């Protein structure tokens, strides 16, 4: 707080102004760091209050995108209730929890002018999971097409007039937010904010909406930051995983025969500015996988409505008025092969990228990188067993071929002895969906993917005991997250530390089966050829969920 | 028009040179001679782009502008050219019938300057577009003659579409002709370097969807040119196109595709292609133990593979034999064991044995005249490695006799120039195959600097050592900064270490009469630098037993003095 | 610089070098260029051949990359720096620098001296060589000029009309037209090709319906009416398709911006005025399609059930093809800008009206963009801006309730042109906007006649003007004092009444921190801010005895050889 303090103020601001908002002694500790942080370097403190204050103020988004993300939250949770485990679905209707939630949600919108038009479409009780769902698809389509015809480049001088006049408020050389995260020991070569560019862009996400402000630094480098006004409060866990897989990267970079192919995790930065607003550099023009699916399906005559519509009415067609049920599973193989056969065919993403790059050279050196870091992605999923990977939760870079994810969330209770997190992933071990297998190789899938996924494990188990000394605290905070999520959490007792150690040995043991060639002549990576032998099989992809989207 | 009493030499000899003319009316008169005397059916002109033009047009200029003349001169007189992939801007008509509600309904008040105005558009824009195909073509041709990047972007878009009318019963003839155009038109095309050369006619084949099924060696011989990354299109496409039928096409595509990967010498797209191509498991075990860096167990598993070979099992695909013995030689050369394969280099492998010239020796004066009876008989088709050896023999001959020949500093520089020829053969992206060449440059500026070091001590027989010759401390201190990096490859590390030890032994046995006069203290003993350092980097890859056995040339002249015992016992203990 | 080397006097050539290495490097990325002999090569050749150096690596790439002439000079200044801390200095640009060194080394009738220099650089370091480059970042994404547009064709040997791409040569042709040292047959025959795609993209927007010549007045009187809904419809709709829309739009933008360039070439100017003027009076009647079509943000709250026609190219790119496209550098084309904007002013103020045309037609829609270029970078853009609004203020001089509605945008833009434009930019920009600010300020103040009219735009304009009498760069401060003098004569009230609203929003940042902090630009800004206060009859006469002791102490402090600073030492900056 006395020497460095710009490496403190971003996080001290939001944890002080969250613990001192929703709530004793800790926020009186957090006032001291801000006060002694205020005495030394005062103009740094006030000059950061300008950025935090104005970025909080002027980027309160609009009165149509709250309705957009409101609709789309209602749809992604609506089909989650429609297929979660409600019934065997014999002509369903809405349960009372839904009507209590969205009658309650009328005050969540703006006050004046939605309310006759949206309240005129569910209070009539004609919602029966056929009017409700298809109605929300109509509202999402009209609202999305409303957000086409808005402006793509809002001028900064009329949007937030202070941040254009910022660089002639010219003193003390504010360093760029988001560079004290990775280490780079010398601390004397950071880029400072020279000026904020005009023409703030405007990105219509598939499930949300955000703008990005792009900064010119004094070296002459232009690089952006996606600003997003609602960030859900499990962002912090996504940040702390972003503190973990960058933390391995030094001793993983120092190792030979990792560095020969330079796997280098390449997981993004994320800094806070608020208890609700974080900015992080979703830079120019790199997409998800789900946006490729929308571009293909609407490039075809269909839309992603017709897939879940297709398996929904085929699935319940095999139950209502005729109930054979040979099982769910052998039926799910049949509808899955119907989806691959008649919709969404093979090598759709390969047909995307080989038609997106001119000069095929530029494509080839694409996937030789794309097969590498996806490997360093899949390990990052297999270690510290996270979640399913919905294909709007992973982000491919379109320049080099990098891969990262939002939603780094580590979550069970089927064993109430050994209660906490880091139990199993359901039916497939990770994501190796066939429409990224047809792009990934079958030659790079073994010569690049497998040997990476072995090389990381033996590169991490034997520097010396690093996984223990990191994962002690970095699993411990997930334990405190597991107690503090429920209203249980009062059992901080010396079972805590061995309760950490059993999951520590579960993970360090878990990264060992793919990690050592033991005694005999194996091929090598036989735990990897085994587990990708399971992760690609259609019997195993048929039983998993439908938002996971095993067809693409 | 038909008088064949003149010989037709000059409709071939300057006539096809008549578009090199760099004069407008000249060139247009020659091409209007050609295009007003030939046929019109575009298939029977696409023959006479490939069947005719027997002029080689040796190595000068992209001759496909004239090809695009012989097919662009057969389009039609269409006056619409309806563009159909862009969803054009907001309409004049249909956008102005989107208000039925409030009947404003102006009723013919066209008495203003608008009466002068609006009709003036309709007379204009009906005649302002009027776009015909031929006028659109004839202003694109002069884009070609200024710049050769539009002929490519027009040929790639054209050629797989005129080919869409090449029906069967004329298919194998066009394939059989285009084979004779890509590789052997009795002509070697050294047409340019790094620019547009054959890629126009080599990218577009990949956009065909399968005319290219026979040749596969034509598709490989075009690698002395450009088009590295442009033929991997043609070879990787069959794996997503072939069937079970005619597997010899398939494994032919995989094996010469593999040695395209050998020329590019990336290995991660090589082992996967073997282990999804191979038959025996022991290739998968062996190659999978190579790519981690564990060459000793891959050596052992190949030794298991030969005794399982030549039996009643699968025929080992008649190339895994060479894979086992060539990787046997490689896995030998990585660790140590320079002494073992010397007599195997004698019974076969003439070009091998000059790589086996580090037989724990550092003098070569026992066979100083017995090597260039092989070096001068290997410098047919030279490489910068073999040229580096032929530079090294005179580099040591100048060290043996005082004042020598000084032939090296006009013998080395073609050593650089051949490596730059190989640099230009490789493509423009940083391939790892460039990697060796960088180390190659790092040795050449160590050869010429070699001709500065001991030649400044052959000349310095002045007997003023340890007070004048501080150039040893300066430039030998400069030998400890081109270290190279701790992850490159083991072969080039042992190369740099042993050959720098040849230089050290020149500056030991070239000091052999200078010894008894004093033994301030001069004695070098800094071969322990590359031995303790190479022991550390020979630990950091793999193989602790090697850096144990590479602390074996340390028991010469004492090697104890400043820090050599420190990291000697540090690395030998901590190993 | 090309006439002394080995001269000893250049230890007096040390007081001036960063003040020129800034003032060469803050323009050399941005001058673009002239008719291409020796234009950015001049500034590169200055920054190389001069005598702490993070500066010099930025032009050093430009020598090796584009230029076949500065090669040996950049190599000879690349060798001589080769200790330990050099690797963070070249660090941002290595993937450029070490790319350029791969371009040179090549066997040809190409030189046998500079390539061996490259080999000597790449061999004198061997471990500083390849540990800086990683698998490659910058790839090519079938960008701006790279997309195809597969128009129909007909080839005489085939039955069916084969579709093939209409635009192979739209990179090369547009590279020919800009290129100066070229024969006129290929450049003229590049203009004959390149605009033909521009004519293809408007071809299915050139047909006009049967009863149309009167229907524009039906569109114009539709603006003056309330409650325009539409039929309640429940139909699905195609969607955006973003990065094909952006490629086709920016493509079309490059075509007609290439028309605007193609005006300033002889034996092409008359023809480019024919096609250019015919496009500009074509692209004003589509603007009323943009008016009543995007009148659907009003006339009721939602009526979500709409028609919303099919997501076509809006023809609001003329908004980004006058201002952005004619901030150019040759500036004979800037005549085509003022001619252009006058022509759309007469047609927009012709078919639509003359008092309502400044309410909904094209003139505010592009005057917003002329506001926007005043906040831009790159002084060429500002020179497009102030010229664009001076063609605004001399045609909306008399017929204007407009300019009093959009005043506070215009004074902010014309004060931001002054407020930050670099010193090495030509000073015909910051003295042709102050005068223009006084032209507008004289126009929009000609009817306030008492000391009471300070309602809204008067209040924000005076608060904006007088509350910025500090910052720095005293073209702006003396521009402000000259503005307050020149609007205190048109119904001249005292300056104090032109300040009494904002006399308290000007002194609290002055008296708030005492002084001896917040470096020199705003310090001289506060003191020369209180030039202008005490030079008037009756204001500001108390409580500043601390200010006088701190400025007076800020000169009795003999600034040589003591603490005349806060953080940066006299030995560092000079």
DSSP string spanning C237-293? -----HHHHHHHHHHHHHHHHHHHHHTTSTTTHHHHHHHHHHHHTTTTTHHHHHHHH
With CB atoms and an 8 Å threshold, state whether A43 touches C518. yes
For residue A521, give the nearest of B271, B272, B301 by CB distance.
B301
User: What is the rounded distance in angstroms from the CA atom of residue B71 to the CA atom of residue B137?
Assistant: 11
For residue A155, give the nearest of C372, C416, C518 by CB distance.
C372
A214: β partners: A224
For helices A305-317 and A329-342, what crossing angle results, to 10°? Answer: 140
The C-alpha of B283 sits at a distance from chain A's nearest C-alpha, in angstroms, of 9
- Chain A's closest residue to C368, CA to CA, is A155
| Best CA proximity match to C407, nearest among C458, C450, C455 | C458
The C-alpha of B491 sits at a distance from chain A's nearest C-alpha, in angstroms, of 14
- Chain A's closest residue to C372, CA to CA, is A155
Number of H helices, E strands in chain A: 22, 10
User: What is the rounded distance in angstroms from the CA atom of residue B260 to the CA atom of residue B276?
Assistant: 17
Q: Which residue has the tokens 């309904």?
A: B105
The C-alpha of C492 sits at a distance from chain A's nearest C-alpha, in angstroms, of 32
- Chain A's closest residue to C85, CA to CA, is A186
Q: Encoding tokens for residue C8?
A: 């000893």
Which residues of chain B lie closer than 8 angstroms to C225, CB-CB?
102, 104
Residue A253 CB burial class (10 angstroms; 0-12, 13-18, ≥19): middle
- The pairs formed by B168-177 with CB atoms below 8 angstroms and a separation of 24 or more are B170/B43, B171/B211, B174/B47, B174/B50, B174/B211, B175/B211, B175/B212, B175/B213, B175/B214, B176/B214, B177/B47, B177/B50, B177/B51
Taking the CA atoms of C134, B285, A462 and A387 in sequence, report the sign of the dihedral they define. Answer: positive
Which three-class secondary structure state does DSSP give residue C30?
coil
Q: Encoding tokens for residue A124?
A: 């009539």
The C-alpha of B138 sits at a distance from chain C's nearest C-alpha, in angstroms, of 8
With CB atoms and an 8 Å threshold, state whether B275 touches A256. no
For helices C41-48 and C71-79, what crossing angle results, to 10°? Answer: 20
Which residues of chain A lie closer than 8 angstroms to B487, CB-CB?
256-257, 259-260
With CB atoms and an 8 Å threshold, state whether A257 touches B275. no
Beta strand residue intervals within B249-348, DSSP E: none
Asked if residue C105 lies in contact with residue A321, where contact means CB atoms within 8 angstroms, the answer is no
| Best CA proximity match to A20, nearest among A33, A4, A38, A36 | A33
Asked if residue A94 lies in contact with residue A132, where contact means CB atoms within 8 angstroms, the answer is yes
With CB atoms and an 8 Å threshold, state whether A260 touches B275. no
Which residues, in sequence order, are CB contacts of C544 under 8 Å at separation 6+? C511
Interface-testing mutation among A447, A514, A516, with chain B (most B C-beta atoms within 10 A): A447
User: What is the rounded distance in angstroms from the CA atom of residue A335 to the CA atom of residue A541?
Assistant: 12
- Chain B's closest residue to A261, CA to CA, is B268
Residue A211 main-chain phi, psi, to 5 deg: -110, 170
- The pairs formed by A345-352 with CB atoms below 8 angstroms and a separation of 24 or more are A346/A434, A346/A435, A346/A438, A347/A435, A347/A438, A347/A439, A347/B240, A348/A292, A348/A293, A348/A296, A348/A435, A348/A552, A349/A289, A349/A292, A349/A435, A349/A436, A349/A438, A349/A439, A349/A552, A350/A438, A350/A439, A352/A292, A352/A295, A352/A296
State the alpha helices, DSSP H only, in A283-401: 290-299, 305-317, 329-342, 348-353, 361-382
User: What is the rounded distance in angstroms from the CA atom of residue A113 to the CA atom of residue C294?
Assistant: 20
User: What is the rounded distance in angstroms from the CA atom of residue B501 to the CA atom of residue B478?
Assistant: 16
The C-alpha of C396 sits at a distance from chain B's nearest C-alpha, in angstroms, of 21
Q: Encoding tokens for residue B481?
A: 């900064």
With CB atoms and an 8 Å threshold, state whether A448 touches B268. yes
User: With helix as H, strand as E and coil as C, how does A225-294 read?
Assistant: EEEECCCCCCHHHHHHHHHHCCCCHHHHHHCCCCCCCCCCCCCCCCEECCCCCEEECCCCCCCECHHHHH
User: What is the rounded distance in angstroms from the CA atom of residue A182 to the CA atom of residue A271?
Assistant: 12
For residue A400, give the nearest of C137, C239, C518 by CB distance.
C137
For residue C127, give the nearest of B78, B114, B482 by CB distance.
B482
| Best CA proximity match to A424, nearest among A333, A537, A503 | A503
Cβ pairs A/C, distance under 8 A: 98
Interface-testing mutation among B90, B134, B167, B486, with chain C (most C C-beta atoms within 10 A): B90
- Chain A's closest residue to B290, CA to CA, is A524
- Chain A's closest residue to C245, CA to CA, is A148
- Chains touching A (3+ CB pairs < 8 Å): B, C
For residue A365, give the nearest of C58, C91, C136 by CB distance.
C136
Resolution (A): 3.7
The C-alpha of C321 sits at a distance from chain A's nearest C-alpha, in angstroms, of 15
With CB atoms and an 8 Å threshold, state whether B104 touches C153. no
State the alpha helices, DSSP H only, in B73-170: 114-128, 133-137, 141-144, 150-162
Which residues of chain B lie closer than 8 angstroms to A364, CB-CB?
229, 232
Neighbours of B220 (CB within 10 A): 19
Asked if residue A242 lies in contact with residue A269, where contact means CB atoms within 8 angstroms, the answer is yes
Query: Alpha-carbon Rg of chain B, whole angstroms?
Result: 35
User: What is the rounded distance in angstroms from the CA atom of residue A67 to the CA atom of residue A320?
Assistant: 36
Cβ pairs A/B, distance under 8 A: 78
Asked if residue C554 lies in contact with residue C516, where contact means CB atoms within 8 angstroms, the answer is yes
Residue C273 main-chain phi, psi, to 5 deg: -75, -30
With CB atoms and an 8 Å threshold, state whether B153 touches C215. no
End-to-end CA separation in angstroms for chain B = 88
| Best CA proximity match to C295, nearest among C220, C228, C366 | C228
With CB atoms and an 8 Å threshold, state whether C281 touches B100. no
Dmax (CA) for chain C in angstroms is: 96
Q: Encoding tokens for residue C254?
A: 């490059």
User: What is the rounded distance in angstroms from the CA atom of residue A266 to the CA atom of residue A249?
Assistant: 9
Q: Which residue has the tokens 């073992």?
A: B340
Interface-testing mutation among A362, A438, A523, with chain B (most B C-beta atoms within 10 A): A523
Residue A245 CB burial class (10 angstroms; 0-12, 13-18, ≥19): buried
Q: Which of residues 487-506 of B touch A (CB under 8 A)?
A: 487
Q: Encoding tokens for residue B479?
A: 């030998």
Q: Which residue has the tokens 């195909």?
A: B133
**Could you give the dihedral angle defined by the CA atoms of residues A266, A267, A268 and A272, in that order, rounded to the nearest 10 degrees?**
-150
Which residues, in sequence order, are CB contacts of B406 under 8 Å at separation 6+? B398, B451
Q: State whether residue B430 sits within 8 Å of chain A by CB.
A: no
The C-alpha of B206 sits at a distance from chain A's nearest C-alpha, in angstroms, of 10
Which residues of chain B lie closer than 8 angstroms to C132, CB-CB?
none
| Best CA proximity match to C250, nearest among A396, B139, A203, A153 | A153
Which three-class secondary structure state does DSSP give residue C433?
coil
Q: Encoding tokens for residue A145?
A: 């097409």
| Best CA proximity match to A135, nearest among A102, A158, A90 | A102
The C-alpha of A204 sits at a distance from chain C's nearest C-alpha, in angstroms, of 10
Asked if residue C72 lies in contact with residue C114, where contact means CB atoms within 8 angstroms, the answer is yes
User: What is the rounded distance in angstroms from the CA atom of residue C375 to the CA atom of residue C122?
Assistant: 45
- Chain B's closest residue to C276, CA to CA, is B128
Which residues of chain B lie closer than 8 angstroms to A257, CB-CB?
292-293, 487, 541
Cβ pairs B/C, distance under 8 A: 307
Distance (Å) of CA C179 to CA A433, C66, C188, C265: 50, 15, 12, 11
| Best CA proximity match to B446, nearest among C543, C332, C124 | C124
- Chain A's closest residue to B268, CA to CA, is A447
Asked if residue C10 lies in contact with residue C51, where contact means CB atoms within 8 angstroms, the answer is yes
Asked if residue C164 lies in contact with residue B161, where contact means CB atoms within 8 angstroms, the answer is yes
User: What is the rounded distance in angstroms from the CA atom of residue C63 to the CA atom of residue C40?
Assistant: 10
């Amino acid at each position: 707080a006395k020497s460095y303090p710009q490496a403190l103020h971003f996080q001290l601001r939001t944890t002080k102004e969250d613990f001192a908002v929703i709530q004793r002694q800790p926020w009186e500790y957090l006032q001291e760091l801000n006060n002694i942080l205020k005495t030394a370097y005062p103009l740094l403190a006030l000059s950061l209050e300008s950025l935090v204050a104005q970025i909080n103020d002027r980027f309160k988004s609009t009165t149509d995108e709250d309705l957009f993300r409101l609709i789309n939250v209602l749809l992604i949770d609506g089909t989650l209730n429609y297929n979660r485990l409600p019934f065997p679905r014999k002509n369903p209707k809405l349960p009372e929890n839904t009507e209590k939630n969205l009658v309650k949600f009328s005050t969540t919108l703006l006050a004046p002018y939605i309310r006759p038009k949206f309240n005129a479409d569910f209070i009539d009780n004609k919602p029966d999971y056929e009017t409700y769902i298809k109605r929300l698809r109509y509202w999402r389509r009209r609202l999305e097409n409303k957000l086409d015809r808005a402006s793509k480049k809002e001028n900064l001088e009329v949007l937030c007039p202070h941040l254009s006049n910022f660089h002639h408020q010219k003193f003390e050389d504010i360093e760029i937010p988001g560079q004290y995260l990775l280490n780079k020991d010398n601390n004397v070569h950071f880029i400072k904010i020279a000026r904020f560019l005009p023409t703030v862009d405007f990105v219509r996400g598939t499930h949300s909406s955000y703008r990005r402000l792009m900064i010119r630094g004094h070296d002459g480098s232009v690089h952006s930051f996606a600003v997003q006004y609602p960030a859900v409060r499990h962002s912090r866990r996504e940040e702390r995983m972003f503190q973990l897989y960058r933390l391995f990267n030094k001793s993983l970079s120092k190792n030979v025969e990792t560095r020969r192919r330079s796997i280098q995790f390449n997981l993004p930065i994320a800094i806070p500015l608020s208890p609700q607003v974080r900015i992080m550099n979703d830079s120019v023009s790199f997409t998800t996988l789900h946006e490729i699916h929308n571009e293909f399906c609407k490039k075809k005559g269909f839309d992603p409505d017709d897939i879940q519509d297709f398996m929904a009415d085929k699935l319940n067609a095999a139950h209502d008025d005729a109930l054979p049920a040979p099982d769910m599973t052998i039926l799910k193989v049949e509808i899955f092969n119907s989806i691959q056969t008649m919709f969404v065919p093979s090598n759709v993403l390969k047909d995307h990228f080989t038609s997106l790059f001119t000069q095929f050279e530029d494509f080839w050196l694409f996937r030789k990188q794309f097969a590498s870091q996806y490997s360093s992605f899949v390990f990052m999923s297999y270690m510290m067993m996270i979640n399913n990977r919905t294909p709007h939760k992973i982000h491919v870079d379109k320049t080099s071929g990098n891969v990262f994810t939002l939603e780094m969330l580590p979550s069970d209770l089927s064993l109430p002895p050994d209660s906490p997190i880091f139990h199993n992933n359901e039916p497939v071990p990770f994501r190796l969906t066939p429409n990224i297998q047809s792009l990934i190789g079958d030659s790079a899938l073994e010569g690049i993917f497998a040997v990476n996924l072995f090389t990381i494990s033996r590169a991490l188990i034997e520097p010396d005991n690093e996984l223990n000394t990191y994962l002690a605290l970095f699993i411990r905070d997930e334990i405190i997250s597991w107690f503090s999520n429920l209203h249980r959490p009062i059992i901080e007792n010396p079972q805590l530390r061995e309760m950490v150690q059993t999951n520590v040995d579960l993970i360090i043991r878990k990264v060992a089966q793919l990690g050592h060639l033991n005694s005999t002549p194996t091929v090598t990576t036989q735990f990897i050829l085994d587990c990708i032998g399971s992760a690609v099989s259609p019997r195993n992809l048929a039983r998993t969920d439908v938002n996971f989207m095993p067809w693409f | 028009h038909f008088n064949n009493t003149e010989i037709t030499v000059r409709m071939e000899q300057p006539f096809l040179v008549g578009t090199r003319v760099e004069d407008i009316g000249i060139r247009k008169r020659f091409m209007t001679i050609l295009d007003n005397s030939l046929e019109r059916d575009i298939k029977e002109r696409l023959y006479y782009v490939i069947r005719d033009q027997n002029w080689e047009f040796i190595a000068d200029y992209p001759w496909l502008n004239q090809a695009l003349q012989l097919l662009y001169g057969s389009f039609n007189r269409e006056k619409e050219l309806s563009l159909k992939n862009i969803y054009c801007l907001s309409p004049p008509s249909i956008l102005q019938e989107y208000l039925p509600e409030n009947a404003e309904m102006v009723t013919e008040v066209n008495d203003l300057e608008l009466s002068n105005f609006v009709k003036g558009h309709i007379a204009s824009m009906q005649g302002l577009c009027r776009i015909i195909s031929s006028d659109f073509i004839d202003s694109l041709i002069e884009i070609f003659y200024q710049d050769p990047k539009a002929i490519h972007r027009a040929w790639v878009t054209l050629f797989p579409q005129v080919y869409k009318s090449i029906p069967k019963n004329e298919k194998y003839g066009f394939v059989r002709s285009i084979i004779t155009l890509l590789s052997k038109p009795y002509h070697t095309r050294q047409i340019s370097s790094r620019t547009n050369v054959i890629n126009m006619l080599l990218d577009s084949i990949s956009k065909i969807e399968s005319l290219e099924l026979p040749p596969h060696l034509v598709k490989y011989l075009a690698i002395s040119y450009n088009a590295w990354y442009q033929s991997i299109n043609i070879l990787e496409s069959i794996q997503s196109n072939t069937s079970i039928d005619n597997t010899k096409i398939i494994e032919a595509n995989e094996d010469a595709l593999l040695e395209l990967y050998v020329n590019l010498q990336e290995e991660d797209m090589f082992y996967g292609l073997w282990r999804r191509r191979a038959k025996y498991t022991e290739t998968n075990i062996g190659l999978s133990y190579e790519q981690i860096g564990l060459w000793d167990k891959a050596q052992q598993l190949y030794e298991v593979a030969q005794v399982k070979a030549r039996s009643g099992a699968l025929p080992y695909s008649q190339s895994e034999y060479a894979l086992w013995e060539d990787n046997w030689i490689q896995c030998a050369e990585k660790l140590q064991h320079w002494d073992v394969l010397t007599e195997l280099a004698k019974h076969e492998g003439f070009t091998d044995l000059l790589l086996e010239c580090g037989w724990r020796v550092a003098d070569w004066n026992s066979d100083r005249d017995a090597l260039e009876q092989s070096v001068k008989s290997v410098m047919d088709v030279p490489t910068p490695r073999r040229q580096m050896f032929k530079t090294f023999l005179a580099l040591q001959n100048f060290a043996e006799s005082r004042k020598g020949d000084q032939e090296v500093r006009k013998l080395c520089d073609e050593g650089i120039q051949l490596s730059l020829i190989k640099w230009v053969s490789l493509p423009i992206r940083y391939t790892p195959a460039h990697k060796w060449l960088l180390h190659g440059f790092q040795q050449y500026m160590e050869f010429l600097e070699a001709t500065q070091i001991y030649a400044n001590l052959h000349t310095t027989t002045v007997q003023n050592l340890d007070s004048k010759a501080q150039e040893i401390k300066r430039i030998l201190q400069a030998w400890r900064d081109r270290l190279p990096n701790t992850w490159d490859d083991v072969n080039m590390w042992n190369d740099l270490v042993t050959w720098r030890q040849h230089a050290f032994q020149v500056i030991n046995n070239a000091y052999l009469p200078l010894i008894p006069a004093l033994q301030a203290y001069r004695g070098y003993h800094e071969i322990a630098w590359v031995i303790n350092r190479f022991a550390h980097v020979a630990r950091k890859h793999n193989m602790p037993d090697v850096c144990i056995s590479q602390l074996a040339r340390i028991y010469t002249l004492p090697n104890i003095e400043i820090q050599e015992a420190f990291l000697k016992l540090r690395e030998q203990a901590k190993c | 610089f090309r006439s002394i080397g080995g001269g000893r006097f250049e230890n007096l050539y040390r007081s001036i070098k960063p003040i020129l290495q800034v003032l060469l490097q803050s323009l050399n990325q941005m001058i673009l260029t002239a008719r291409l002999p020796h234009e950015r090569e001049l500034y590169v050749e200055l920054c190389i051949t001069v005598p702490y150096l993070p500066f010099l690596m930025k032009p050093l790439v430009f020598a090796l990359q584009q230029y076949p002439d500065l090669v040996s000079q950049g190599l000879r200044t690349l060798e001589l720096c080769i200790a330990e801390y050099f690797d963070p200095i070249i660090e941002p640009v290595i993937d450029d620098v070490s790319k350029a060194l791969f371009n040179l080394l090549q066997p040809q009738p190409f030189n046998h001296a500079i390539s061996h220099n490259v080999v000597r650089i790449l061999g004198k370091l061997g471990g500083r060589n390849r540990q800086f480059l990683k698998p490659p970042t910058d790839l090519t994404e079938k960008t701006e000029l790279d997309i195809d547009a597969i128009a129909d064709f007909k080839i005489n040997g085939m039955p069916e009309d084969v579709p093939l791409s209409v635009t192979p040569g739209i990179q090369s042709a547009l590279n020919i037209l800009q290129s100066y040292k070229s024969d006129i047959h290929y450049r003229k025959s590049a203009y004959k090709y390149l605009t033909c795609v521009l004519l293809l993209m408007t071809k299915s927007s050139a047909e006009f319906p049967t009863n149309y010549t009167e229907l524009l007045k039906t569109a114009v009187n539709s603006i003056k009416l309330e409650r325009i809904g539409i039929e309640k419809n429940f139909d699905l709709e195609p969607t955006v398709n973003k990065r094909d829309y952006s490629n086709q739009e920016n493509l079309f933008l490059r075509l007609l911006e290439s028309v605007f360039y193609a005006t300033s070439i002889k034996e092409l100017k008359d023809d480019a005025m024919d096609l250019l003027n015919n496009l500009l009076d074509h692209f004003c009647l589509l603007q009323v399609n943009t008016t009543l079509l995007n009148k659907r943000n009003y006339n009721g709250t939602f009526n979500i059930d709409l028609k919303n026609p099919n997501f076509m190219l809006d023809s609001s790119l003329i908004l980004d093809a006058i201002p952005f496209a004619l901030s150019y550098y040759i500036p004979e084309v800037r005549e085509v800008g003022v001619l252009a904007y006058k022509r759309i002013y007469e047609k927009s103020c012709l078919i639509y009206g003359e008092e309502l045309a400044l309410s909904h037609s094209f003139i505010p829609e592009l005057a917003k963009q002329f506001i926007h270029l005043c906040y831009d970078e790159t002084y060429y853009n500002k020179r497009g801006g102030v010229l664009g609004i001076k063609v605004l203020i001399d045609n909306v001089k008399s017929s204007s309730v407009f300019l009093k509605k959009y005043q506070y945008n215009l004074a902010n833009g014309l004060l931001f042109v002054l407020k930050d434009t670099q010193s090495e930019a030509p000073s015909a920009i910051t003295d042709s906007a102050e005068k223009l600010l006084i032209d507008l300020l004289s126009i929009t103040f000609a009817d306030v006649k008492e000391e009471d009219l300070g309602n809204k735009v008067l209040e924000n304009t005076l608060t904006d003007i007088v509350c910025e009498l500090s910052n720095a760069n005293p073209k702006v401060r003396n521009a402000c004092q000259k503005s307050l003098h020149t609007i205190s004569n048109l119904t001249g009230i005292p300056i104090v009444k032109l300040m009494d609203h904002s006399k308290q929003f000007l002194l609290s940042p002055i008296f708030a921190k005492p002084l001896r902090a917040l470096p020199f630009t705003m310090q001289i800004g506060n003191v020369d801010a209180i030039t202008f206060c005490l030079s008037l009859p009756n204001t500001f006469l108390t409580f500043n005895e601390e200010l006088f002791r701190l400025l007076q102490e800020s000169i009795v402090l003999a600034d040589a050889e003591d603490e005349s600073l806060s953080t940066n030492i006299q030995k560092t900056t000079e």
